[PDB]
Design a protein around this ligand. Sequence first.
Ligand SMILES: COc1ccc2nc(COc3ccc(CC4SC(=O)NC4=O)cc3)n(C)c2c1
Lengths: 254, 259
Amino acid sequence: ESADLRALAKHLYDSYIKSFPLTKAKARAILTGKSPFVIYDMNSLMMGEDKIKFKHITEVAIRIFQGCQFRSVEAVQEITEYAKSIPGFVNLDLNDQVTLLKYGVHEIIYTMLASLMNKDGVLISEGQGFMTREFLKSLRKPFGDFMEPKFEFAVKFNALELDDSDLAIFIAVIILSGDRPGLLNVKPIEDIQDNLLQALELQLKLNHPESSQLFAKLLQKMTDLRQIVTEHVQLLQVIKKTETPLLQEIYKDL
Amino acid sequence: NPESADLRALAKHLYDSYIKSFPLTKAKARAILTGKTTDKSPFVIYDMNSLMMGEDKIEVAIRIFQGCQFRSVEAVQEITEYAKSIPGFVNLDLNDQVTLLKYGVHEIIYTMLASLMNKDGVLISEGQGFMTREFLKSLRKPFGDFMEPKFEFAVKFNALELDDSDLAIFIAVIILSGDRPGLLNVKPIEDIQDNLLQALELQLKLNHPESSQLFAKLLQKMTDLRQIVTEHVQLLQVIKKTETDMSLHPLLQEIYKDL
Ligand SMILES: COc1ccc2nc(COc3ccc(CC4SC(=O)NC4=O)cc3)n(C)c2c1
């Protein structure tokens, strides 16, 4: 039966590679050596907009935030395509699929955002750029407190040294959360998630044999994820109290 | 089935997103309009007393017009949700996304409005109601002329007998139009629409194997869609002068601006 867990792990890894262009191995190779444009202050931001091809350009902090929402929309679509590859997901109730995605995209977005972050900054524009953590902190309030929680999460999460094949199953586990509010049929969701959790346990034990309870710690990280999301939507409504048409319909979330 | 399987997967994806984005599909509209139910029967509005009676379970011409406006805003929200699910759409330039929605939203609105129509009237309020064509024609000028072109187009267009799986790809093709005014990068939009047109051609061949050249006729209906949108914006340009005390919805204002 363990061969079946390995088959599921390989399937999810292949789908993960198909769905996410900027993998953690690529981002890690860019952050060490293999040449992204670094944005460290306002002038390097200017030259970045004049040199890098950004798609969100129609105050500076509002612009940075709006780009980080463009990327979030793209991410939601990639996560949707990946979720459709999880065995049993498409056979679920359609409303349940919509609910699972609706409540999972944020936790997955920050999980994978950790893959593009180190203690000093975050990759941007499919790895073409690297915006420093200090330049993000230097943004005016409340926009200066948006990314620091994500950095603090990414340090501890990256300390687990997970690879893409681990993150594929971990993300698949996040999607199939049977406690999302409004679900109509929880039984098949929790069944799929139990199979995915078995696959994740076997994967972590075969891929990290020196880490005794890495599975448990990875499960413990999900509480931190829900804290980052829960405390992020607060900054999102306060952000709705600091920014006063057709563009706002595209970004009714993020 | 070589690369046809990729187009079939794209069709299934678009149909799934379609069902997830529009709560009143054509299938449910036809189940309501015909007689497949005793639970899906609508309340029929055809005069003043049936309107006043039907205002329990969800000026007069102004009220109906505002209802059409609210339904239009809701439709723009649903079409936006569906557009974000078109592969490659959210990867385009943001300005081009705004433009594509801006010029495609009403063509899609009337296309799907055909699904809620017969020759006698149109479903309203999620199918709970059904307002007749002649009651809409009886409204004061020029509100009485607002819906007739939509009814004529819907009569000609419903003859193609498309189901929801066809309409998903068709409205996807409508969104990814490279001839919209003001687009920055036409080439990617045209690549996506080339893929969507392949998917639509295959879907119409497999779903309607007896409908000869249904692809061409469906593509030709976009002319009628264009003419309908133009006549509507002209009517609006009259209403803006006759009714100085009425307001168009801000989203609708931004849509119609420089159309
Ligand atoms: C209160 O009674 C109601 C309630 C809702 C109804 N919906 C419809 C028909 O649905 C329509 C018709 C036209 C449009 C296009 C329009 S109209 C406008 O002002 N701006 C647009 O973009 C969009 C939806 N009718 C007849 C209604 C009657």
